[PDB]
Amino acid sequence: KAKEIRDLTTSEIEEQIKSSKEELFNLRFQLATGQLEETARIRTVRKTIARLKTVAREREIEQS
RNA sequence: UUAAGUUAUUAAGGGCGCACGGUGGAUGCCUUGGCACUAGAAGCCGAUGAAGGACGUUACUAACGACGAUAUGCUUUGGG
Ligand SMILES: [Mg+2]
């Protein structure tokens, strides 16, 4: 996903970070009520956040 | 039949021998871990916050290992 993330702009990555965190939080609430049934989405969204934070961190270090 | 003698039988339990079981973990075989060394490298890190820890991180989860709110992991370069 990193190659696709690198095509996004800086404002887009922040928006992706916010939206991914909302999705993960929604998954956690569904899991706590026994409604999820798709538990592999949790790990997938968590790693997407990790990739998104990595690309943002690289750009700031690179520019600085 | 009497009289006078003699000597068995019984095993409540026990003894010796044998047979078959149990308990127990010796012995044999085995090695996951140790012990003594050889050769080469290296030895000591820390306010750019150490050594050592606490608490957390997996869909479910107690403990250990790995990891640190990017958490049972992220990127990249090579290997496969
Ligand atoms: Mg008897």
Place of tokens 């990790």: A50
Resolution (A): 2.2
Note whether A50 and A16 are within 8 A (CB): no
- Experimental technique for the deposited model: cryo-EM
Q: Would you give the end-to-end CA distance of chain A in angstroms?
A: 24
A4-13 b/e with 16+ CB inside 10 Å = b? ebeeeeeeeb
- Ligand 1 center–CA A61 separation, angstroms: 99
Note whether A48 and A1 are within 8 A (CB): yes
**Residue A52 CA, nucleotide B49 C1', distance (Å):** 29
| Domain limits for position A8 | 1-60
Distance CA A2, CA A27 (A): 23
Distance CA A19, CA A24 (A): 9
Q: By three-state DSSP, how is residue A47 classified? A: helix
CA angle A3/A9/A10 to nearest 5° reads 110
Place of tokens 């939080």: A25
Q: Where are the alpha helices (DSSP H) in A1-64?
A: 2-7, 10-32, 40-63
Q: How many domains does chain A have?
A: 1
